[PDB]
Amino acid sequence: EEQVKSFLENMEVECNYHCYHEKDPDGCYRLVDYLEGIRKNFDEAAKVLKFNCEENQHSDSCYKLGAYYVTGKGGLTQDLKAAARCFLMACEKPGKKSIAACHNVGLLAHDGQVNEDGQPDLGKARDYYTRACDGGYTSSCFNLSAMFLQGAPGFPKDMDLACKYSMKACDLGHIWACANASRMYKLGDGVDKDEAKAEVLKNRAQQLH
């Protein structure tokens, strides 16, 4: 039906009005959904995302924009540092993508390439992974646990926290966290020795997978 097409194509006009003239951040985000899922025009999706993140500071737009920057989508040059900036905005400004954005901030900061000297910044990684971990993002809890198992030039090893975040990871589903947590309770590495729980943790780890 040509009316259904017409009513559909008019949603774009209305979203353009709300975005380009009222500057409604949610209007701009609606426009993006439209440009991606209906028109499949990612180069135009990119421009709106750019406006909506940089000018309107819309969290979910910043997230999506960072995702585009990782691969160079919609005409954007592939750019990890910009991806990082966008994910930082989205993690900080609360939205539906924040938790996922926080994990990404931790990962990139841990790994270091986007830091101003190219080195790891585990201090920053910890703060952003902590938010992610408390929101249920299992890899944040694990990557955070691993940081405390290992330690590094400016980041001391700490079994107490290592065990704590292994536990949160193991709760949420993570095999290697249950296994690492088992040999901490069995030994008493930064936690009081408990051999019943240690056997439980080993069993939880074999059970998972």
From Swiss-Prot:
Primary place of residence? mitochondrion
- Family annotation (InterPro entries): HcpB-like, Sel1-like, TPR-like_helical_dom_sf
Q: What is the disease in the record?
A: Spinocerebellar ataxia, autosomal recessive, with axonal neuropathy 3: A form of spinocerebellar ataxia, a clinically and genetically heterogeneous group of cerebellar disorders due to degeneration of the cerebellum with variable involvement of the brainstem and spinal cord. SCAN3 is an autosomal recessive disorder characterized by onset in the first decade of slowly progressive distal muscle weakness and atrophy and distal sensory impairment due to an axonal peripheral neuropathy.
Domain of life of the source = Eukaryota
Q: What is this protein called?
A: Cytochrome c oxidase assembly factor 7
Give the UniProt keywords, A-Z. Answer: Acetylation, Disease variant, Mitochondrion, Neurodegeneration, Neuropathy, Repeat
Q: Which GO terms describe its molecular function?
A: protein-disulfide reductase activity
Q: Which Pfam families match?
A: Sel1
GO cellular component term, pick one: mitochondrial intermembrane space
Ranges: Sel1-like repeats? 25-57, 59-95, 99-137, 138-174, 175-209
One GO biological process term: respiratory chain complex IV assembly
What biological function has been recorded for the protein in this entry?
Answer: Required for assembly of mitochondrial respiratory chain complex I and complex IV.
UniProt lists the family membership as follows:
Belongs to the hcp beta-lactamase family.
On subunit structure and binding partners, the annotation says: Interacts with CHCHD4/MIA40 through transient intermolecular disulfide bonds.
Which compartments does it reside in?
Mitochondrion intermembrane space
Task: Give the matching SMART domains.
Answer: SEL1 (SM00671)
